[PDB]
Tab-separated table of C-alpha atoms and ligand atoms in Angstrom:
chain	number	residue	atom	x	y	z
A	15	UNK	CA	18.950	-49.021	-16.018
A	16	UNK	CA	16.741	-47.252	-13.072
A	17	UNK	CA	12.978	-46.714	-13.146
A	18	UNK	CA	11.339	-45.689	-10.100
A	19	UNK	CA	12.752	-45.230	-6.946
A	20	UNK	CA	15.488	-42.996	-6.903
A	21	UNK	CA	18.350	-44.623	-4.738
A	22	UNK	CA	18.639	-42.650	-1.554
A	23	UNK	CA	15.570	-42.196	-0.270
A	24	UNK	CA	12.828	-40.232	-2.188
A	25	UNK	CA	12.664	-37.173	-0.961
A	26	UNK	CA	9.174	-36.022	1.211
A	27	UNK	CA	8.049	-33.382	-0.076
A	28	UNK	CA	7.303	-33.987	-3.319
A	29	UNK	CA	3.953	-33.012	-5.590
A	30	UNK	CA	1.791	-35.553	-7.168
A	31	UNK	CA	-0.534	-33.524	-8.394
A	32	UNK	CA	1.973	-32.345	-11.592
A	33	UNK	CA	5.044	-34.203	-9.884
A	34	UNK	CA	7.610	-31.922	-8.933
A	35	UNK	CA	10.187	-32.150	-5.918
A	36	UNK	CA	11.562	-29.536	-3.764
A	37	UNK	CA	14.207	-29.320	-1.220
A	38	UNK	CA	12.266	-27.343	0.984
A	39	UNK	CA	8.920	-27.775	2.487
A	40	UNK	CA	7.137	-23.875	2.625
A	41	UNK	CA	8.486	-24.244	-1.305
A	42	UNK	CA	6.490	-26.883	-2.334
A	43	UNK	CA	3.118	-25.158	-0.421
A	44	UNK	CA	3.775	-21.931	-2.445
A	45	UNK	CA	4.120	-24.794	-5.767
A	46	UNK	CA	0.794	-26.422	-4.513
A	47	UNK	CA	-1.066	-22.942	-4.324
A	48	UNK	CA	-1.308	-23.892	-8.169
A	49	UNK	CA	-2.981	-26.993	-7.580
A	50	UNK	CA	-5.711	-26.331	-5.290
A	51	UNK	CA	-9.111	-25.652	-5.950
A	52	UNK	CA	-13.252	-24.943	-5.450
A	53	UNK	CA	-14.265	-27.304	-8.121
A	54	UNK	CA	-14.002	-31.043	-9.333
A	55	UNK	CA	-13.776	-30.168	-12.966
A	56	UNK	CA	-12.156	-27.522	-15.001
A	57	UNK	CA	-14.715	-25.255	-16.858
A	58	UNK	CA	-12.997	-23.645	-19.401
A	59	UNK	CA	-16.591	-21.875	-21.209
A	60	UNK	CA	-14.606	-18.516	-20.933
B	26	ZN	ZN1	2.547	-29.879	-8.762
């Protein structure tokens, strides 16, 4: 079968933070708002 690479050309913007595609650029920004951050770690101390 197919592992990697999809075929025609991967498309550029993609996410590797999670790893999802889009087929528009602003969309993956607004995706990557949910990504970003002030901190290295993740405190989760409530
Ligand atoms: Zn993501």
């Amino acid at each position: 079968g197919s592992s990697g690479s999809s075929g025609a050309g991967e498309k550029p913007y993609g996410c590797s933070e999670c790893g999802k595609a889009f087929s528009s650029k602003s969309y993956l920004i607004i995706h990557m708002r949910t990504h970003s951050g002030e901190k290295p770690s993740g405190p989760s101390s409530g």
